[PDB]
Design a protein around this nucleic acid. Structure first.
Ligand SMILES: [Ca+2]
Ligand SMILES: [Ca+2]
Ligand SMILES: [Ca+2]
Ligand SMILES: [Ca+2]
Lengths: 153, 154
DNA sequence: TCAGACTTCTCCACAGGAGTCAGA
DNA sequence: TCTGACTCCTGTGGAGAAGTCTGA
């Protein structure tokens, strides 16, 4: 639970609203109770010639990782606890992605009670649909409906 | 001269380093001294669905305009005095585009003089080249060498 | 003549997902 | 059982130019 400098957070929020992404996903999984698991991700993308900027970001946030894919690189953070802490601090400064952040925070807090009632799980999956609805989603496959079809069994 | 709030400049700098562009151009221009007209632009691009976000910038910066192009909108500020004023205050907070901003400010200032000798003008054109070089430039046509071509000829 | 309002074009550099896998 | 690290892909939503056309 580290506390970030407020000027760092204001600049970072602007950069995230622009080149970043707050992502919620339902991923198929045979070994889990409801055959699906959730994955939340904070993401900043940038051409690989500017990877250094993403490197500095790892050091500043103090967690996460950079990966390369083609001519582009990404800072990523999916680890639940640090993510919940980070977004909680960034959230008030976000303008375009404030809702996505809030939905992700809500999802994380409900994670525990979501792995019990199939009905509660679906509810949380609906929060996921809402994040995707807010994003510029274009290649999405697995939704809360997908989960339903599967639960009906 | 409008003064801007600091927390505003901090967030905007981040957003500009992300979705923004600081652009220097040499444009043709028959009805002109050296047949090339200089043009500077600060710009922010966004899907037209989020045009409101750009509309607000017009109000917060206090000048500039929003226009549409396909599925996308842009905030633009080209007017030289306010551009100078705005970039001077933003520049301190920029991370990826700080050098482009300083070059634009440098060009704006050395402008009146750059319209004296074909050399002073041409030297400022090389400042334009640097901006483009620092940008992810892909569809550029007119450079300082395009200028030297029209000057070393006449 | 001229800066400044306004339009068009092109090539990515993002965003926003889909997955596989290995060690908890 | 399950999560978090890591890779790969699509389809734009950007960026970074290129231009035309007034008015004073
Ligand atoms: Ca963006
Ligand atoms: Ca959407
Ligand atoms: Ca960018
Ligand atoms: Ca470059």
């Amino acid at each position: 639970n580290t506390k970030y400098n407020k000027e760092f957070l204001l600049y970072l929020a602007g950069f995230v609203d622009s080149d970043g992404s707050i992502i919620a996903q339902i991923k198929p999984n045979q070994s889990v109770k409801f055959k699906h698991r959730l994955q939340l991700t904070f993401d900043v993308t940038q051409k690989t010639q500017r990877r250094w900027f993403l490197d500095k970001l790892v050091d500043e946030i103090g967690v996460g990782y950079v990966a390369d894919s083609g001519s582009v690189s990404k800072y990523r953070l999916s680890e639940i606890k640090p993510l919940h802490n980070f977004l909680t601090q960034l959230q008030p400064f976000l303008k375009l992605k404030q809702k996505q952040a809030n939905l992700v925070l809500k999802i994380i807090e409900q994670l525990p009670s979501a792995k019990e009632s199939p009905d509660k799980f679906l509810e949380v999956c609906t929060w996921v649909d809402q994040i995707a609805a807010l994003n510029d989603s274009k290649t999405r496959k697995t939704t809360s409906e997908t989960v339903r079809a599967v639960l009906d069994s």
